[PDB]
Amino acid sequence: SVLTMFRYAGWLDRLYMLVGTLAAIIHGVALPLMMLIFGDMTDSFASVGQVSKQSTQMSEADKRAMFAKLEEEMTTYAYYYTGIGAGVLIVAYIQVSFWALAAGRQIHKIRQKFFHAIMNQEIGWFDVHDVGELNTRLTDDVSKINEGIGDKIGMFFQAMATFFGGFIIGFTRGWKLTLVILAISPVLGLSAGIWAKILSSFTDKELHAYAKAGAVAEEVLAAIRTVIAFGGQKKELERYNNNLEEAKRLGIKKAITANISMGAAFLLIYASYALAFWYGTSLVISKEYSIGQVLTVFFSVLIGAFSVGQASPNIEAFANARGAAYEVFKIIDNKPSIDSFSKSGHKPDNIQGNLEFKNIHFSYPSRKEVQILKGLNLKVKSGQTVALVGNSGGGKSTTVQLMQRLYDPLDGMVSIDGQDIRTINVRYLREIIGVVSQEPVLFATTIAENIRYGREDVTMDEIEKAVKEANAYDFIMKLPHQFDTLVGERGAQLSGGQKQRIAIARALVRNPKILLLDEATSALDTESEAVVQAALDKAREGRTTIVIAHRLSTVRNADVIAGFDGGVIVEQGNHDELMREKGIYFKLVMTQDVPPASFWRILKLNSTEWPYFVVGIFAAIINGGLQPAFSVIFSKVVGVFTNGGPPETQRQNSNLFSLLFLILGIISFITFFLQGFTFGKAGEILTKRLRYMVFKSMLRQDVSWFDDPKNTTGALTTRLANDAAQVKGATGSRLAVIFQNIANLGTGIIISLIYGWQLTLLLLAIVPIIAIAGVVEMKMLSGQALKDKKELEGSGKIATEAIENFRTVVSLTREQKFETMYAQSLQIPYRNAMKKAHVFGITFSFTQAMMYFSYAAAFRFGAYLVTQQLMTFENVLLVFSAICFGAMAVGQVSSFAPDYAKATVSASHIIRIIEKTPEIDSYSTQGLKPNMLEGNVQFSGVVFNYPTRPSIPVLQGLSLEVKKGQTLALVGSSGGGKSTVVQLLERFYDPMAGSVFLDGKEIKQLNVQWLRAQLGIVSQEPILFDRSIAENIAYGDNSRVVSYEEIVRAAKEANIHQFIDSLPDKYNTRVGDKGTQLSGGQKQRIAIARALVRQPHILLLDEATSALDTESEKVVQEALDKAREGRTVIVIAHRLSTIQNADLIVVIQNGKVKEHGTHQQLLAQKGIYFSMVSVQA
């Protein structure tokens, strides 16, 4: 799969690439042609003149005239060099700008198509794969592609042109010697190819490891409340660290192989030098060639050899890009069997729903050996209501998922109006179906936008009508900003009942002819449930509905009732018929200033491996100084080779130069490898340390930090990955080349000051000018860098919001809306990339142009000095070479400066997140750890305000008391603050008024880890992790290796053990992301077991039996009653029996305690609890 990286290159894109390639060819061949112009004559020296006093030459007047002639020749050469500099100015800008624009367009289209491909997959594909990596891909791999299809290919083609044009000039002049060097060239090609293949494979593995780490981080951050409650920060940090170690090892291998490749290239270049000199000597004694011929060949070929040796980093970048582009285009090329974006299907104009399920056999793709439905049969007529009843894991949610065709059945047929649903358009099929899931999931936006996700072209009046139909109007009206209130991830900033009612309204605005309600009133209370049922009954004739529920009134009111038993339906009829059939339904009803200093600050964290720094520095000075030193050595060797005054063997003896060239090649190989490897290893270790430290700091943060809309899970993951990537991009094998260039400039200055003088004053003139160019570029790029970061975060958020909630997006047919949102988010980075392309291309063109222009100015000034006889003609060439190398060094440093600007802000953000301290420090060892606690919980006038909505009073100073062995039942309406009490007792937030005492001690004076370890909580929405069942249960009691036997007994205590035993792989069965690959009852029971394995002193239950059977509820209640005394228990529920069985009951009216006492005490008085118990009875 090669050249797939350019799959999305259009006509304009290909034109940009072609013109950039042509400009690269011209720019590359400019140099060998310029040296051949010097080779137009034999000696490259217009006249020996005074330097040769071989003949008497006693002319004091004619020497002045021939000096004037030399000045004229130098002036003509300077004019030619100025023209070549202008041409270079044009061509370098053209090539870099065109290639960078091409890369930007391809990256934009690749991101768009990758997101489209991700949104185009099936539910089963999302179940099989760890989709948590995908976002990291969108952030990381595409970027690795961007630095491999940009300016790097332009530079590679330029150096290829230099090399091959020099070789063509060689075939023109000295074909035999040129063929001898082109015989060595294949070794360079083979080495480059092999090392590029190895580097691409290593990059693929490293990016896989980074994607694994990103998936781990995304899962941990999405469930940060569970991690904080159970104190799992260390374990998640270790899980991140394992993938960090793998990525670090792969990066070290990548650096090793890249530096081997570069050093081998340089060694081969020097070996080509040595062999060319040998063969030229051999031919120049045999009289086959003249001295001018072999010098011409040398000057034509060897500089291009150096050019390819310098080019090899672009090959490294292209190999990294190819390694990155593997999984992206593997996912892009995947074709789902159920295509939601296909336009080929039937679209019936009139559909009176006739849901038929004919001998349906189904098994989930992730767990395919287990059978769920075995010949399911159902016939639902138009406008009727069917109530699906059974036990947990029976397959009711499976039937709901099959109705909307999230999966296809292996056997059987699902049809509507006698038409099989596989022949109907998938988008049209899911558009006529409105579904409310077992535990709904919203999106991190306003309430109005969440409602509009059901149907986009919806007016505000009918939104209001649907919200009234869902009994949600009152609390939205009480909310400031109305329906523009922002809700957290998955509706985390709304209560369970409010979130469920918002989901109901979202389903209702769809105006569905097929309604699916999978426990739509699980989190509702009596009044809201009653009014919602009345509202649904008002408009029940128009549509056909399927309902799964726990309350008996809604099951009785259904037109027909179906009962699940072992994958089939065993009872199907009216309520009276099933009542008189004494079946399963019978026993169910019976049972009742962005500082620049930040760079150095981050590099100070890299001080542990300082020997790598010093070794790399030494090697960088060695090679950077060797380059101008080799410029002098080559000139001296050429001069000695020309002066063959002793005739032949003296010159065979000059083979010592091939020795010296081989020695220099060995030294260059060793030093280049050593410098690159040391810097790359230190930088990769720094990258690991930054990832680890930033993730640890993120885990240290408070719940309010994650409640901030800007600290979204996708935003957090994108921030982490991108900040680390930028700092790595400025701290890899690149700082080495800045040190090498500094050494190059220093050595050039030294050699120009030794051999000559008054010409280095020109070098001190060029160093400012070129630098100032990069300077402004740097500033400008920094001016946009921050913006880009922000935009990327936003884009990342959208992508994660689409991936973490993919089932909801598929059910809502909102994939196109999220694609449009992703494109709108990516809009700003696109224009930023185009502008940066233009600016950096201008910078490169300016650097090369001033290189050439200052070289011409050096010609002019040196000619003036020679005419004045202030400084000899022989040494001007070495000073000119030093000027050229210094200009190249400064230009390369200025080219680096953009990356320094881009990573300065990332380093600042990294330092900011590291040094941030939360208000409630979960990592602090300071605090009070009582030796033994009695478990007495007391809220004393606690007033709490949520930081995201600070004005709204949630708790207005309610008093609460519960003792050891007591059970406290918190009752109230939705939004009253029952879960707020649980979240406050976990020290998620600190109340501003009032205080919570645990055995008389304020919870702010205790160690937060110790306090959290004393409490076991079951949340309103249980959340598991994408790992094994046993690992999920053992996650309850961290800081201790939980044994298998106690996991088994905790599962037994939660009535989930039998289901685990029935599963293949038993307790090693992997659960999906957030528990999505489990039944709601099974997931809730596993959460209960996770809480119970702790054996906590303070048990907190928040609707812990929201989705359980009568059998499961009875078993769990008996298990809790076994251990009532000896632990304090607080329970939030709307079931009458659970509340009336508790020791004490507290009623919370809009945040205040209103009634407190036993069940009989509250029943005897005529209050709201009496009203509830009377309504239920």
Ligand X SMILES: CC(C)CCC[C@@H](C)[C@H]1CC[C@H]2[C@@H]3CC=C4C[C@@H](OC(=O)CCC(=O)O)CC[C@]4(C)[C@H]3CC[C@]12C
Ligand Y SMILES: *SC[C@@H]1NC(=O)c2csc(n2)[C@H](C)NC(=O)c2csc(n2)[C@H](C)NC(=O)c2csc1n2
Ligand Z SMILES: CCCCCCCCCCC(CCCCCCCCCC)(CO[C@H]1O[C@@H](CO)[C@H](O[C@@H]2O[C@@H](CO)[C@H](O)[C@@H](O)[C@@H]2O)[C@@H](O)[C@@H]1O)CO[C@H]1O[C@@H](CO)[C@H](O[C@@H]2O[C@@H](CO)[C@H](O)[C@@H](O)[C@@H]2O)[C@@H](O)[C@H]1O
Residues of this chain that interact with ligand X (CB under 6 A) are 2-3, 6-7, 9, 14, 17, 153, 156, 163, 182, 185-186, 188-190, 192-194, 196-197, 200-201, 308, 314-315, 318-319, 322
Tokens matching residue 848: 């090369």
Among 777, 791, 801, 1109, binds ligand Z (CB under 6 A): 777
Number of residue whose CB is nearest ligand ATP: 397
89 lines the binding site for ligand Z (CB under 6 A): yes
Among 554, 1020, 1055, 1084, binds Mg ion (CB under 5 A): 1020
Using a 10 angstrom Cβ sphere, with 0-12 exposed, 13-18 middle and 19 or more buried, the burial of residue 1155 is middle
Considering only 264, 839, 1088, 1139, the residue that binds ligand Z (CB under 6 A) is: 839
Q: Which residue is nearest to ligand Y (CB)?
A: 884
Residue from 722, 808, 979, 1105 that binds Mg ion (CB under 5 A)? 979
273 touches ligand Y (CB under 6 A): no
CA 1073/CA 873 separation, integer angstroms: 77
CB of 738 to ligand X, least distance (A): 23
Strand order in the sheet with 514-518: 433-436, 514-518, 544-548, 385-389, 560-565, 568-573
Position among 881, 973, 983, 1112 found at the interface with ligand Y (CB under 6 A) = 881
The answer to whether 747 contacts ligand Y (rule: CB under 6 A) is no
Task: Report the residue from 436, 523, 1146, 1162 that binds ligand ATP according to the rule CB under 6 A.
Answer: 523
Binding ligand ATP (rule: CB under 6 A), the pick from 366, 415, 1095, 1117 is: 366
Among ligand X, Mg ion, ligand ATP, none, what does residue 3 contact (CB within 5–8 Å per kind)?
ligand X
Residue 741 binding ligand Y, by CB under 6 A: no
Least separation in angstroms between CB 35 and ligand Y? 6
Least distance between ligand X and beta carbon 765 (Å):
36
Residue 498, interface with ligand ATP (CB under 6 A)? yes
Residue 303: which of ligand Y, ligand X, ligand Z, none does it interact with, CB under 5 to 8 A by kind?
ligand Y
Q: Are 177 and 292 in contact (CB under 8 A)?
A: no
From the list 235, 214, 222, the residue with the least C-alpha distance to 1034 is 235
Residue 75, C-beta contacts closer than 8 angstroms, at least 6 positions apart: 859, 860, 863
Q: Where is 938: in which H helix or E strand?
A: strand 937-944
User: What gap in Å lies between CA 1019 and CA 1102, rounded to an integer?
Assistant: 5
Which C-beta is closer to ligand Z: that of 477 or that of 772?
772
Determine the straight-line distance between the first and last CA of the chain, rounded to whole angstroms.
70
Contact 1106, 1084 (CB under 8 A): yes
Tokens of 125: 């594909």
Please report, as residue ranges, which positions from 1044 to 1103 form the binding site for ligand ATP (by CB under 6 A).
Answer: 1072, 1076-1082
Residue 19 CA, distance from chain mean position: 34
Query: Which residue in 520, 812, 954, 1099 binds ligand ATP (CB under 6 A)?
Result: 954
Q: Give the Cα separation of 885 and 249 in Å (integer).
A: 36
Q: Is 884 in the site for ligand Y (CB under 6 A)?
A: yes
For 340, 351, 383, 413, 513, the CA distances from 417, given in Å and listed in that order, are 21, 7, 12, 12, 12
Contact window for ligand Z (CB under 6 A) among 472-480, 545-553, 773-781, 962-970 = 773-781
Q: Does residue 979 touch ligand ATP according to CB under 6 A?
A: yes
| Tokens encoding 548 | 């799964």
User: Residue 498 interacts with Mg ion (CB under 5 A)?
Assistant: no
Q: Whose CA is closest to 158, among 38, 313, 323?
A: 313
Q: According to the binding rule CB under 6 A, does residue 34 interact with ligand Y? A: yes
**Smallest separation (angstroms) from ligand Y to the CB of 630:** 6
Using rule CB under 6 A, residue 1130 touches ligand ATP:
no
The three-point CA angle 1159-1160-1162 to 5° equals 65
- According to CB under 5 A, which one of 438, 795, 881, 1055 is a site residue for Mg ion? 438
> Cβ(520)–Cβ(435) under 8 Å?
no
Q: How far is CA 876 from CA 300, 477, 529, 597, in A?
A: 21, 85, 94, 41
93 binds ligand Z (CB under 6 A): yes
Give the range of 312-320, 558-566, 628-636, 747-755 binding ligand Y by CB under 6 A: 628-636
Of 811, 736, 769, the residue nearest 400 (C-alpha) = 811
Q: In Å, what is the CA distance from 857 to each residue of 45, 73, 91, 793?
A: 19, 14, 21, 49
Subset of residues 1052 to 1081 that bind Mg ion, contact rule: CB under 5 A:
1080
DSSP conformation class of 422: G
Q: Is 631 in the site for ligand Y (CB under 6 A)?
A: yes
Please report how close the Cβ of residue 447 comes to ligand ATP at its closest, in angstroms: 11
Is residue 343 classed exposed, middle or buried when 0-12, 13-18 and 19+ CB atoms within 10 A define those classes? exposed
Binding site partner of 975, from ligand ATP, ligand Y, ligand Z, none, Cβ cut-off 5-8 A by kind: ligand ATP
What residues contact residue 570 under an 8 Å CB cut-off, 6+ apart?
563, 564, 583, 584
Report d(CA 1070, CA 1172) in Å as an integer. Answer: 42
Provide, rounded to whole angstroms, the least separation between the CB of residue 16 and ligand Z: 10
According to the binding rule CB under 6 A, does residue 771 interact with ligand Z? no
From candidates 38, 705, 946, 1010, binder to ligand Y by CB under 6 A:
38
Q: How far apart are CA 573 and CA 586, in angstroms?
A: 12
Pick from 120, 450, 495, 713 the residue near ligand ATP by CB under 6 A. Answer: 495
Q: Phi-psi category of 466—alpha, beta or left, where left has phi over 0 and alpha has psi -120 to 50?
A: alpha
Binding site residues, ligand Y, CB under 6 A: 31, 34-35, 38, 44, 303, 306, 631, 634-635, 881, 884-885
Binding site residues, ligand Z, CB under 6 A: 89, 93, 773, 776-777, 838-839, 842-843, 845-846
Binding site residues, Mg ion, CB under 5 A: 397, 438, 495-496, 979, 1020, 1080
Binding site residues, ligand ATP, CB under 6 A: 127, 364, 366-367, 372, 390, 392-398, 438, 488, 492-498, 523, 707, 946, 948-949, 954, 972, 974-980, 1020, 1072, 1076-1082, 1107
